[PDB]
Structures are given as C-alpha cells and as structure tokens.
Design an enzyme around this catalytic site. Structure first.
Site, PDB file in Angstrom:
ATOM      1  N   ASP A 229       1.294  -1.407   0.291  1.00  0.00           N
ATOM      2  CA  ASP A 229      -0.091   0.333   0.019  1.00  0.00           C
ATOM      3  C   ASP A 229       0.771   1.070   0.044  1.00  0.00           C
ATOM      4  O   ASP A 229       0.387   2.191  -0.104  1.00  0.00           O
ATOM      5  CB  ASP A 229      -1.430  -0.365   1.152  1.00  0.00           C
ATOM      6  CG  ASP A 229      -1.692  -0.865   1.216  1.00  0.00           C
ATOM      7  OD1 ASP A 229      -2.502  -1.516   0.202  1.00  0.00           O
ATOM      8  OD2 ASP A 229      -3.017  -1.226   2.283  1.00  0.00           O
TER       9      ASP A 229
ATOM     10  N   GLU B 186      12.885   2.720   5.568  1.00  0.00           N
ATOM     11  CA  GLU B 186      11.275   1.445   6.935  1.00  0.00           C
ATOM     12  C   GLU B 186      11.000   3.370   6.537  1.00  0.00           C
ATOM     13  O   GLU B 186      10.276   3.961   7.844  1.00  0.00           O
ATOM     14  CB  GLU B 186      12.443   1.349   7.856  1.00  0.00           C
ATOM     15  CG  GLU B 186      13.238  -0.106   7.805  1.00  0.00           C
ATOM     16  CD  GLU B 186      13.457  -0.399   8.736  1.00  0.00           C
ATOM     17  OE1 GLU B 186      12.965  -0.957   9.693  1.00  0.00           O
ATOM     18  OE2 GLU B 186      14.580  -0.362   9.015  1.00  0.00           O
TER      19      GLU B 186
ATOM     20  N   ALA C 295      18.859   9.414  15.519  1.00  0.00           N
ATOM     21  CA  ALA C 295      17.445   9.469  16.519  1.00  0.00           C
ATOM     22  C   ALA C 295      16.658   9.909  16.624  1.00  0.00           C
ATOM     23  O   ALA C 295      17.236  10.540  17.834  1.00  0.00           O
ATOM     24  CB  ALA C 295      17.499   7.536  17.088  1.00  0.00           C
TER      25      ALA C 295
HETATM   26 MG   LIG Z   1      -3.581  -2.741   2.883  1.00  0.00          MG
HETATM   27 NA    NA Z   2      -1.623  -0.459   4.819  1.00  0.00          NA
END
Ligand SMILES: [Mg+2]
Ligand code: NA
Ligand SMILES: CC(C)(COP(=O)(O)OP(=O)(O)OC[C@H]1O[C@@H](n2cnc3c(N)ncnc32)[C@H](O)[C@@H]1OP(=O)(O)O)[C@@H](O)C(=O)NCCC(=O)NCCSC(=O)CCC(=O)O
Ligand SMILES: CC(C)(COP(=O)(O)OP(=O)(O)OC[C@H]1O[C@@H](n2cnc3c(N)ncnc32)[C@H](O)[C@@H]1OP(=O)(O)O)[C@@H](O)C(=O)NCCC(=O)NCCSC(=O)CCC(=O)O
Ligand SMILES: CC(C)(COP(=O)(O)OP(=O)(O)OC[C@H]1O[C@@H](n2cnc3c(N)ncnc32)[C@H](O)[C@@H]1OP(=O)(O)O)[C@@H](O)C(=O)NCCC(=O)NCCSC(=O)CCC(=O)O
Ligand SMILES: [Mg+2]
Ligand SMILES: [Mg+2]
Ligand SMILES: [Mg+2]
Ligand SMILES: [Mg+2]
Ligand code: NA
Lengths: 307, 297, 304
Positions: free
Chosen positions: C163, C196, C252
């Site tokens: 997604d 990420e 970080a």
């Molecule tokens: Mg999804």
């Molecule tokens: Na998602």
C-alpha cells in the site's frame, strides 16, 4: 527438557518446487524428536484440508498436505516448512518470544508475491499476472518473506486495526490492541494486555499493562546496543513519537517526542550523568528532555530513587 | 433535539450479534423514538433486495433494517444505532461533536473483517477453512470499527491508503489524507487540509490547516479534547498536546505537550497549556540553547 | 532526446475519462511524436485480447492502446502518457528525474481503486450497490496514483506492505521497503537500501543508504530537490530537510530542517542548509546542552 513441535499443514509450492508458504491450522508442542516434513497419505489428510489441495494452472503453483515435525525448538529452522511452523507456534501463543530458535529465517524463507489469488513466485510473475487478470483484478498485498499473521491465525482476546502491520510470528497476548500505527514483527510482541500504537522490532517483548504510544520506536535504526535485544517490563508507557534503545524494567515512562538511545547521556537528579545503557533494565524511571535546558534527564517515579 | 434514521443492510453473526450495518442513505430527522426494525418485503429498496441472504460458510445472515435515533444527544443504544451515528459523521451530515459518540467501544462487536465480508471471532478458524474453498482468505483487520470507504466515499476527498480512515471520520471537501495520515472516528477536518499525520478521536482540524507527515495530535502522554483552527501547520514528526487557534505553526520534530514549559519572547516561561487556543504562534526548539520557545507570527 | 512507447490496457470511466493504463512492457525509443491510438485487432497481444471488454456494473470499458511519448523532457499531455512515465520509472528504465514528472497531479484522474478494479468517483455509491451482488466491495484508496506492484513487481526487491509504494517509485535491486517505509512517485533508491521511512516525490537515496523507521525526508530544500548519497543512515524517527552527500548520519529522533542552526566542531554555527550535500557528517542533538551539533566522521573534517 528439549521440546519439539509438529503440525499438519497446507503448503503452496511454486513452479520450481520452492516452498512459498505453509498454513498449519492446529500446530502443537511435542516431545523432542526428529525433524522432517512428509507428504501426507490420502487417509491422513483432515477432511477440511482435502478440499483445498490442487494445482493452479494460472499461478503455476500446487497446494499439498504435509506433516512437519521439529525435533527440537532449540535448533535453527531447517527449511521453510519448519520456519512456518515456528512462526505459527509464536502467533498461536504456544511459545513466547525467544521460547524457540527464531534465527536464520531470512535465509530459509522464500521471497513471495502475496496476491488476492494466493502466494505466487517472483519468477514468471508478470505472465502470471496477465493470466490471473482473466479472473478479475490482480492485487499484490506485498512482496516479502513473511506474510500477514491474521491470514494464518486470529488469536483470541486481540484487536488489530490494520492487519497489514502484524507479521506472522508475532505474539499478541490477550488484551492487546494493535492500532493502525502499531507494528509487530516476528518473534516479538506482548506478554499481557498492551495498547500497541508504535513499532515493536523483531525479538522485542513488552510486559503486561505496558502501552506503546503512537509512532513510538522500540529498537529502531541508530537506537544503540546492536548485540542484545531489548524488552520492556510491566506498566511502562512510551509516549507518542518517542523512541527506546535500552531495556526498561517495570513502571518506566518515556516522554512523548523523546528518543532514548543507549549512547544518550542522561543527567540524573544528583546532577551526575551516565549513558542510558547504564540504566538498562532499571524500574521506576521517567525519561524526559528538559524544555528549558534541552538536557535529557531521568527522574525516579515512585518517590524512592534511581540506584 | 435532532434525531436520525436510515435503511441499512446489517450482517448478523451465527449467534445473532450485529457485525455491521451499511446505510446507503442516512439522514437527519426531527426528534423521535429510538428503535431498529426489520423491513417488510414491500419496504426494502430494490438495490438492497438482491443483497439479502444467508452465508452458510461464514454462518452469517444479511438483513434489511430501518434504524431510527430519537435524539443525537443520547448514547448509542445498540450496534445498529452506533453504525448509523458513524455514517452520519462520514457522510458529513453531522460534524464531530455534533452527536454523542461516547460508549461505542462498549456497544460495537469485535469483528474479523475479510475479503468475504464481516465474520464473528467465534468459530473463525473453521469459517476460514470453509471459505478457502472459494479462494484465498484475507483478513483486513480484527476490530470494532471498519474502514470508512467501505461504507461511503465522501466527495472532494482523496485517501491514498484507505486502511487509515475509520468509519466515523469526517473529511471535508478539499481534504487529502496521504499514506501516513490517519483519522479516527468522530474526528477529522472541517475544510480543506492535507493530512499526513494522526488525528485522534474527537480531534478536529480547521480549514486550511495541514498536518505534516508522522505528526501526532493528542497522542499518548501529550498532556478536554483538543482542536486545531484555520491555516495552521504541524511540522512533520511533530506532536501537539494543546489546542491551537488560527495561524499557528509547530516546527518539524517538536512535540508540544500540555506540560512542556515554553519560553516567550520576553524570557518568561509558561506551561504550554496556558497557551492552549492562542492564535499566531510559532513553536520551535531553539537549536542553539535547547529551549522550547514560542514566537509571534 | 529520448522518447518512449508501450502497448497498454486502459480502463475508461463512463464519461470516457481514463482511470488507468497498465503497460506490461514499456520501452525507451528514439525521439518521435506523442500520441495514443486504439490498437487494431491484429495488433493486440494475445494476452491482452482476453482482457478487453465492458463492465456493465462499474460502467467502465477496458481497451487496448499504444501510447508514444515523443520526448521524455516534455510534460505529460494526458493520463495515458502519465501512466507510461510512471511505468518507465517503476520498471527502472529511467531513474528519477530522468524524465519530466511535472504536472501529473493536473493530468491524472482521481480514481476509486476497488477489489473490482478502478472505478470513477461519479456515481460510485450506485456502482458499489451493484457490485455487492458479486461479493464484498473493498475500496483500497481514492487517489490519482495507484499501487506500484499492481502494475509491476521489480526484481531484487521486498515491499512488506505494498500500500506504501506508489506507481512511479523507482526501487533498485537490493532495496527493502518495510511497513513504515513509504516511497512516492519519481523517487526511490539507486542501489541497495533498507527503507523504513518516507521518501518524498523527487527524492533519491544512494546505494547502501538506510532510512530508519518513521524517518521523514522532505522533498526540497525550503528550489532544490533533496537527495541522499551513498552509505548514509537516517536514525529512526529522524527528519531531513537538506541534502546529504556520502557517509552521513542523522541521529535517531533528530529533525534537521534547512533553517536549524547547527554548531560545528569549531563552536561557530551555520544554518543546516549551508551544509547541504556535504559528506562525512554526523548530526545529533547534544543531550547535555540541547544544541544541534554536526561532527566530522572518520577524521575527515567538515566542508561547507
Ligand atoms: Mg492494506
Ligand atoms: Na496499509
Ligand atoms: O534552571 P530552571 O530551574 O530555570 O529550569 P528547570 O528547573 O530545569 O525547569 C523549570 C521547571 O519546569 C519543569 N520541566 C522542565 N522540562 C520539562 C518537561 N519536558 N516536561 C514537564 N516539565 C518540565 C522542571 O521540572 C521545573 O519544575 P519546578 O520548577 O516545578 O521544579
Ligand atoms: C520552524 C519552521 C516552521 C521555520 O520556518 P521558516 O519558513 O522561518 O524557515 P527559515 O527561513 O529556515 O527560518 C527562519 C529563521 O529562523 C531560524 N531557525 C529556524 N529554526 C530554528 C530553530 N529551531 N532554532 C533557532 N533558529 C531557527 C533560521 O535559521 C532562520 O534564521 P534567519 O532569521 O537568520 O533567517 C521550519 O523550520 C519548519 O519546521 N517547517 C516544517 C515544515 C514541515 O514539516 N512541513 C510539513 C510538510 S513536509 C512533510 O510532511 C515531510 C515528508 C514526510 O514526513 O512524509
Ligand atoms: O560528546 P563527545 O565530545 O564525546 O563526542 P564523541 O566522542 O565524538 O561522540 C561519542 C560519544 O557521545 C555520546 N553521545 C551519544 N549521543 C549523544 C548526544 N545526543 N548528546 C551528547 N552526547 C552523546 C556517546 O555516548 C559517546 O560517548 P563516549 O565519548 O564516552 O564514547
Ligand atoms: Mg518494581
Ligand atoms: Mg507511521
Ligand atoms: Mg547493488
Ligand atoms: Mg566520500
Ligand atoms: Na492479565
């Protein structure tokens, strides 16, 4: 003292024989034994699985019934069936994180194109896509070695707002809610009731009653202590967008927006400072950044004192 | 007060619990008497008549009902009523806080949301094996609230990843929710906003205000629900634990909690909560002295 | 001057609007003349012929077209051309910024992406009711850009949650995008990267650089595009509003905006923008003083 495990599974193989996945409806622990996966004979196939065995000509895959046995949960996974069994044992809560060897999985698992028609190999996928599209839309959920937990088991007592965000092999104890911003990796998760709105890295364990705030990072990139895995104990609270690179004991808090790395210098009430790793595993600690000085500080939370 | 009503298609689990209800056309009404009734054959709209039946694999049934709420001020009495309230919000027939959205956790059923429709948690593993005879079984989530877009797509909006907008979210025309944005129920935008961060339940964001990527509004340990006024900007990875008026900015990466001590232009400091609701404020952490400060804009 | 071409399966709305086009095999070509034409029967590949038709419930049609782009430096003229550009990027035939990706927002149709295929906004609630005769109707998104993997899966890549990767993202082999990773169009990695966090449109990340969990990369320097060189590391929950050269680290939890004043080893400070594109830098917020600092890495000293 050695424990083994076994399960009857439905495995999907790619056209070249590569194991794409295996779903074990009822894994179980067993006495230690001999690791092997065998194809089940007709009479041994549970009736519910018998209707699911077949070959998909468009995907060029086959689904077969197997029985997988692990001689010792201390051993590394030998092959993908063994890997999938270990991941199921964790998500079924039959074993807690670190209760089995979860080493070496990246190396053993196949990279899979997960679709709304089932697992597919990477090889030949674009021709597979064109063939599948005769059936309707082809949607790819992800391309990865680990699929979505809930597509194998939905543990009871749990809510997962967006199930894209929980890998198979995640351990979610009763009372746990994973919200949309929550993420739980394999060999990781919660021992009791937790609200999880941040990210629990592989190997990370969160104790009963501890909450992970939205966007919070546990054991993320540059958080610190490369070697040892971190955990948090009971009744801890990580603020939204905070981060944590040391273990916490019980009753600790990290302020919203604060990233406590193992190498961060923290000023204590007595005015001395230590690296945060020196506090790793301590209880009753509150970490904050002073809004006037900008210094990272740690305070005792019980009226008693740091140590 | 105002009531509401709608004809819905409900899905019941094997034990009769309400898993969900889709209301294609809810509407507001004069105050009246709360009740849900099963529609008689002659009252079922023809679009819905083809959708009623029983699914023997899922052990569910889909039925046509009419739900009436006598007063939007009352607490939801049952899941049909709860679903109707959430639809009123996502249809923008009612703005957040415009009806009573309390108690829903207590009223709504925890549901296994699948590519074959809603299922109960009870007996799910047996259901899964039966459904796999139809093709793959994909579970989108296990929760009391489903995805808004699966009930209504409101006009003038974009939602890049619709996993991230709960039914009950209110998104005004001109609003874009990007992949990192998240909008909970009884919450959302009143005007045109770019939403790339997290809008907690109860939180409303005024026209022209943008929420930067990964921003947190009213998150854990941030600090009376908060709201953001018009033309505000929350920087990426920022956080907000107090209400903002109009024309406020929070610097990228800064979390302003209600208990954060803020330095003003004159060198005096105050807890950020004292500034709650002010307009024309820029919040930042001074990169030289380390102090959270506010400046006039 | 380079052009491009591809045979595509286009889905049109009831009013003739292009919802999408899937191009199985786009290719670069000599400079030429932009146009999209409907393919004659003899020119439709056998695998696409079986997919052409009309969906009466959705009120859509799928047609076979060939789209030619005369020059990749021109702006997309219409949605077929835009989709071809996006496919060129995702097939790695062109790297980000190797073709003009401007004006796509204005050219592309807003689409209701469903488990029954693309649908128009127009009349969608009635379409939903008709399609529910077939089974559940799931809407993945409502947007001008669909999910890359629904058009091509590039080899040598992992995407944990697809997604989060728009069609037009360029993911070089060895790249892994984890669940918190996001990659926009005309953006992505040039080699092996762990992603990420969020790579904005136009942003390129060099070989071996990793973007930590929840990290934020702005698109431009508050009008120069932001990029990251080789072997850089952005810590979790960090943010970057300047370019980095090679061998840079952002701690970080630290957000380095272009206007942030950074203190240097010599104790003078500069705006972070003055360091944009430099190598061998480590940015941190000093945990005693509260100040944002930059340190030279590996005895390399610091260049403005
Ligand atoms: Mg999804
Ligand atoms: Na998602
Ligand atoms: O030197 P100063 O005393 O001026 O600065 P300071 O004492 O460090 O800070 C002033 C007050 O603000 C508080 N304070 C500082 N940073 C904070 C944060 N992130 N959240 C909540 N409170 C905070 C201190 O505990 C102190 O409380 P008290 O003044 O109430 O002790
Ligand atoms: C704080 C602001 C708002 C300041 O904005 P300005 O336009 O003033 O920027 P500027 O010109 O660089 O700054 C004005 C002056 O203040 C100084 N200055 C800036 N920040 C400072 C600080 N923290 N401490 C001390 N001085 C500071 C500058 O050096 C400059 O100095 P002189 O006076 O000497 O000139 C900004 O830096 C910021 O944080 N914007 C965030 C934008 C954002 O996140 N947008 C969200 C969409 S982006 C997104 O969502 C990311 C992608 C994703 O995450 O998915
Ligand atoms: O500070 P220094 O002058 O020591 O800088 P350095 O030695 O170049 O950087 C490494 C040291 O900085 C500490 N360190 C890490 N992060 C920090 C931060 N955000 N603020 C202040 N100090 C920090 C590490 O624990 C490490 O300790 P050591 O210097 O003790 O290794
Ligand atoms: Mg204790
Ligand atoms: Mg996120
Ligand atoms: Mg390489
Ligand atoms: Mg170099
Ligand atoms: Na308990």
């Amino acid at each position: 003292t050695v424990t083994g495990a076994a399960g009857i599974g439905l495995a999907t193989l790619a056209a070249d024989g590569s194991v794409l996945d295996t779903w074990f409806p009822a894994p179980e622990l067993t006495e230690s034994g001999t690791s092997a996966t065998s194809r089940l004979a007709v009479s041994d196939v549970p009736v519910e699985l018998a209707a699911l065995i077949g070959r998909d000509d468009d995907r060029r895959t086959e689904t077969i019934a197997v029985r997988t046995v692990i001689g010792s949960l201390d051993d590394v996974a030998a092959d993908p069936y063994d890997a999938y069994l270990r991941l199921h044992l964790l998500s079924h809560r039959l074993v807690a994180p670190h209760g089995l060897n979860a080493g070496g999985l990246f190396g053993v698992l196949t990279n899979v194109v997960w679709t709304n028609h089932g697992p597919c190999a990477i090889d030949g996928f674009e021709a597979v896509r064109a063939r599948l599209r005769r059936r309707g839309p082809v949607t790819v959920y992800g391309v990865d070695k680990f699929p979505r937990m809930v597509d194998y088991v939905v543990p009871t007592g749990v809510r997962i707002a967006d199930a894209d965000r929980v890998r198979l092999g995640a351990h979610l104890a009763p009372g746990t809610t994973v919200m949309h911003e929550g993420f739980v990796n394999y060999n990781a998760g919660t021992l009791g009731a937790s609200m999880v709105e941040g990210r629990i890295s592989a190997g990370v364990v969160v104790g009963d009653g501890s909450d992970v705030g939205g966007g919070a990072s546990i054991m993320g990139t540059l958080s610190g202590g490369g070697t040892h895995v971190i955990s948090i104990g009971k009744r801890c609270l990580l603020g939204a967008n905070s981060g944590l690179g040391i273990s916490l004991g019980d009753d600790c808090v990290v302020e919203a927006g604060l990233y406590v790395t193992a190498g961060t210098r923290v000023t204590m009430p007595d005015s001395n400072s230590v690296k945060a790793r020196e506090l790793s595993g301590s209880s009753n600690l509150l970490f904050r950044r002073n809004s006037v000085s900008g210094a990272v500080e740690v305070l005792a939370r019980d009226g008693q004192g740091i140590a």
